[PDB]
Amino acid sequence: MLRIIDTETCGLQGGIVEIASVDVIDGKIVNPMSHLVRPDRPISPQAMAIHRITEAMVADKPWIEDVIPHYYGSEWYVAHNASFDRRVLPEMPGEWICTMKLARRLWPGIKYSNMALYKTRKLNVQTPPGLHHHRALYDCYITAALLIDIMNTSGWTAEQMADITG
Amino acid sequence: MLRIIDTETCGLQGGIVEIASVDVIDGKIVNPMSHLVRPDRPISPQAMAIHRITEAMVADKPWIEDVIPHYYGSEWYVAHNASFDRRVLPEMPGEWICTMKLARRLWPGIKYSNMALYKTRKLNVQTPPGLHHHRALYDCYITAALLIDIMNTSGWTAEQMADITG
DNA sequence: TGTGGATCCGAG
DNA sequence: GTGGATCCGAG
Ligand code: NA
Ligand code: NA
Ligand code: NA
Ligand code: NA
């Protein structure tokens, strides 16, 4: 089982306003999870412009400390540009896999953003009703759909994608 | 006064075989100096392919230590990619202006070799009789013409230029 | 055959 | 506030 993690934040420096994962078993996506989170800092305007999550939405939510345990249960954590989420999240009990690094080894000379790959690779996932891009669970599905494409194409195991990831 | 310095070396790591310089005063090029130099090391064939200066040509020439002192006594020093000449030469007694950096700043999206600039700017200068690109005294005239044009176009001051260079 | 330096990229 | 990849100048 590979668990894709995505996160929304107050800015590039961190503070968590949302977290989500989907799990990947037998090349299928299952077991969606997502939580709005009460951050440790103001939500930057430039951040708010992106994910559209307001102070009002998170003010009654638990802290990242409180919420993270729900995401335990996985040897492997997959994140697009995993280095970000790795930094801004608290220490996870798995090992990491970055779908950005992998897509660059897999398909050199292309464009390497979550949404760029998804279009380029002409992919189609059953997306969650009612969330736009750069939300939380949405991008997980995009990233997962992209993880599947990547495994199918290369046949890479978990532990191979971990090592490549570095 | 601005002194344009150029150098032909044994390679990218150093080892002078030619120094040369010209001075810019009121947009005119004056006081040419040039010396074939005996390098502290073999002229790699890679470098020699460029400047076409043979071992024979420099066998009975002075060391760079007997010859640099002719080039001291200026407040400013101009070289194209100053950070090369600066590195391969003895500590020079002034302030440095790099025309490569000024060009990148003045004209973005362009190519930035001493000869690319010259052609792009369609500059015309009187180059010493029977020398050649990578001939030393030859590129000093080219770079002086570049400096001159940069100065016409930006109205930058010697001090402004150094600051830019960094 | 190396340096370095800029200069874009990814993540929000 | 930044770390990872490239590309480009000088001989
Ligand atoms: Na993300
Ligand atoms: Na996102
Ligand atoms: Na030079
Ligand atoms: Na030269």
Could you name the key traits of this structure?
homodimer, 166 residues, alpha/beta, Nucleotidyltransferase, domain 5, five-stranded mixed beta sheet, 5 strands, binds sodium ion, DNA-binding, magnesium (chains A, B)
What's this entry about, in short?
With 166 residues, chain A is of the alpha/beta class. In chain A, 38% of the residues lie in helices and 21% in strands.
Polypeptide structure, described:
Chains A, B: Its EC number is 3.1.11.-. Chains A, B: GO terms for molecular function: 3'-5' exonuclease activity; nucleic acid binding. The structure is a homodimer of 166-residue chains. The first copy, chain A, is of the alpha/beta class. Chain A has a single domain, classed as Ribonuclease H-like superfamily/Ribonuclease H (Nucleotidyltransferase, domain 5, 2-Layer Sandwich). In chain A, 38% of the residues lie in helices and 21% in strands. Chain A contains eight helices and five strands. A five-stranded mixed sheet of chain A has the order 3-2-1-4-5, sandwiched between helices. In chain A, helix 5 packs parallel to helix 7. Chain A is globular. The two termini of chain A are 20 Å apart. The chains hardly touch. The structure holds sodium ion (4 copies). Chain B binds a DNA duplex (12 and 11 nucleotides) through helix 1, helix 4 and helix 5.
